[PDB]
């Protein structure tokens, strides 16, 4: 059962990472830019070395 609890803790840690962001002006823009780029990233074929 400890593995179930550990995956749960991993998800909780990630939401902690996401929640706290009360960003400022300069950061907010590049934050949106990076999120857009990362969302672009997921749709690539990473397992292909050429990509």
């Amino acid at each position: 059962s400890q593995t179930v609890l550990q995956a749960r803790a991993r998800s909780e840690r990630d939401v902690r990472g996401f929640m706290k962001t009360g960003l400022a002006a300069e950061h907010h823009r590049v934050g949106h830019l990076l999120n857009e780029f990362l969302n672009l990233a997921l749709k690539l074929d990473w397992q292909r070395q050429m990509i």
Binding site: T21, R29, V30, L34, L38, A41, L44
Partner: protein
Amino acid sequence: SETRTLQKIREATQELLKYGLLEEASKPNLYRIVLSHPEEVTRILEPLDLDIGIDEIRGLLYVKVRLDETPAQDEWAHPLVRRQRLNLEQSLLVAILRQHFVAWEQESGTGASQAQIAIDDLLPQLQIYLGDPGSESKERTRLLTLLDQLKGHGLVTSPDAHERIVIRPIIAHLADPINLQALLAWLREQIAQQT
């Protein structure tokens, strides 16, 4: 007799060319020397089609390719540059590093480079894109190879004793909004070709 450039300026510019960048927090003397005669450094680097960018806020001087008449195809074709062009797995790692960098800068302001992240924190992030080969050692080797490649470009220090790295502030200028929005358009185009 002959006009010899100030010894300090010569040493500072030679070292700056050597390392590609020069930070206040690690070599303040040469950094200040350059900041005291920036037009001297521009006059020195102009003939090689190299220039000097500046960020006094973070305390960083980085040589960047002159734009005047360099081939628009890419500045990496420049004869003197030695390091290979960045590749998109490295660019993914750069994006994650920049996200962590801004996250830390929010709390610490634009202070000295205390931007440190445990190696373990990267593995979950990369695991999403680069898959799960089901062997923590294998993915650690993969990540460490990527970080070695990036240290080749000066974006991150090599891992220390506690499996931690420090993100060199130069990343903010390799991943600034204009560069990010050029890369984003190019990547959207690539995905469109994939479809």
